[PDB]
Design a protein around this ligand. Sequence first.
Ligand SMILES: Nc1ncnc2c1ncn2[C@@H]1O[C@H](COP(=O)(O)OP(=O)(O)O)[C@@H](O)[C@H]1O
Lengths: 302, 53, 69, 239, 49
Amino acid sequence: KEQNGDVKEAASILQELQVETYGSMEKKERVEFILEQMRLCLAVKDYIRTQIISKKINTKFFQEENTEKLKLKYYNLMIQLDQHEGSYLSICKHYRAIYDTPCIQAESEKWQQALKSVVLYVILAPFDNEQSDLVHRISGDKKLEEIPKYKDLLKLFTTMELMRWSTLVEDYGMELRKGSLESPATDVFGSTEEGEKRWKDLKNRVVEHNIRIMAKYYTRITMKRMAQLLDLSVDESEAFLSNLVVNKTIFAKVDRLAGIINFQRPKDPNNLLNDWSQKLNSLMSLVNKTTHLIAKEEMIHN
Amino acid sequence: IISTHLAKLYDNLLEQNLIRVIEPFSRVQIEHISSLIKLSKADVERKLSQMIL
Amino acid sequence: SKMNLSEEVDLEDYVARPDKISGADINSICQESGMLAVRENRYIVLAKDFEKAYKTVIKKDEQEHEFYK
Amino acid sequence: SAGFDRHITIFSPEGRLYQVEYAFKAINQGGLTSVAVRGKDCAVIVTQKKVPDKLLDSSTVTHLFKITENIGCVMTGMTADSRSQVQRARYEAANWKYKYGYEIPVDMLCKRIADISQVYTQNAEMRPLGCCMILIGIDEEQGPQVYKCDPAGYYCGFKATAAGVKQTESTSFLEKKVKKKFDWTFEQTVETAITCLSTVLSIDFKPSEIEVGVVTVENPKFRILTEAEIDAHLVALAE
Amino acid sequence: EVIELPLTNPELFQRVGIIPPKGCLLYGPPGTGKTLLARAVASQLDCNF
Ligand SMILES: Nc1ncnc2c1ncn2[C@@H]1O[C@H](COP(=O)(O)OP(=O)(O)O)[C@@H](O)[C@H]1O
């Protein structure tokens, strides 16, 4: 039926089958039937049924002898599903699982594409403790060196300094979107519709990282400078900052009258005097320690 | 019944929208907030005054 | 309210039925309809499943031995 | 509550007669099942024919008893009490013929049977006859008729029915079948009865395990289908 | 059909709304393998049992 173009009818017929009920058939064939059902459902664009079917198939079974192809196909289908949904962190986990597969590991190009996609999707994923830990784990991969630009970008997204979107584009647009014979560009940032959406999401992630850096370092940055540093219009930058603040991602107080983006939380007198007391206590302890070392030095050089 | 209850619902909706649009700001000018809510300047001013009072 | 339900399901069709059922019966009807929907690998409850569950739940005579009435 | 179930004439606290229900349950002791299907112009009943011994005489075990050339019965439950009730039904039909001329309609015949059973249940003198009495027979001006009328004394008009261990399942199957209005023909009626029995019992229904009796408008005489006719009906049913 | 669907996909049960599938019963002749049924179905999970 699929060969005749009636994809909907084939999906309908195959969905009715309950592969799990067929306990007689071998586990590998059951998993293959589940994968076929998932592919048909995704082709029909019924992502809920695809999610249910994927939950039907277990993940432990992929730790077997000849399940390389099954793991690859299942993770590709799950990548498709979570790409439609928009969860980049799950996509990154799936691509990391794909990159761990021995068949992908052996071949240079396959593992290279897997690692490039993993780095890109870690970059795209929203900042979070889990995402930060995942980036930390991925960064310490010696094999990343074989792909220079992607590892450079991954490091740049962990360094605590501003990266300008204009400069980042001027540096990595050719290498990330188009690629070359020596730079096999992935489809993550492709020119397709999903490609443009994910490019905009990458710009959003870059601006979020920039705003986080400012909030960590600055205390009052004018709206003009914030817009310049984030590579956005004044109104658009203000809207993005307001959206971030409403969600509680970062603390800010947009004084639209004077264009002030004060970041510091209000300093209650108790906290200010507590900070002064902490400074004084540290000073006293350091003075005692320096006196001890000073007595030691006087003792030694009699 | 419809008139009174819909007026109350409109008041509640305006209150919620105004509270939502002032969360990021700290010294927002009234014209910008009125534009964000898509309402006359005088109406937003009166509603804000009543809310504060 | 919590159940997924579907557009084609009109609970008013069932509410007006003259059958005298307690709230526990209503909860049982809803749970049975949902579980029938889940059995057919359907995550959306439709009119057919609700009607079948209602007919099943309403049935409470059991034997009754046919002469007590 | 449970102390009122030792005499048949004592009412339970909630308004129940426990001995009548106990006899109803005893109906199942025979371990058999019988089903009757009323067609458009025919009435067919099929009952299990269990012979768990090579030394038994299969001709003497048949449960389909002919009350009269025009009226039929199939006793399900206790064998001795069923045979006693069949003899009483034959007597009732003969007396009706002798006193009023025209053959007693099936409904009247085992309405008299059920009245006897009820008079048994009211006055505590005899244990109620624990055997369901399924009657068939063509009645002029009323087409085929099948009436089931039981120990407690309840008789009703049935388009299809069954009595025995597997009664609820058979009646549910008939309800699922009786609803799709279709040509209720002799062959169709026999096929539906045999199919319901086979599905309820989940058995391949060898020809020597079933016994069938049919009354038709064209031939309004109780006829017990032989092995050949039953086998032919079964082969038609399969294909 | 009774212990697999609830275990594998609680999301579909929660998506529909009907959370509790509990209950179940295996009435029948005494000790004809009733425990074994709860053992054979223990092929996956059923650890504590
Ligand atoms: N169908 C069966 N398959 C396997 N073992 C059985 C079966 N029927 C009975 N048994 C045996 O009987 C025992 C099971 O008894 P069980 O049904 O657990 O009793 P109870 O129902 O009182 O718990 C087991 O030791 C088992 O070997």
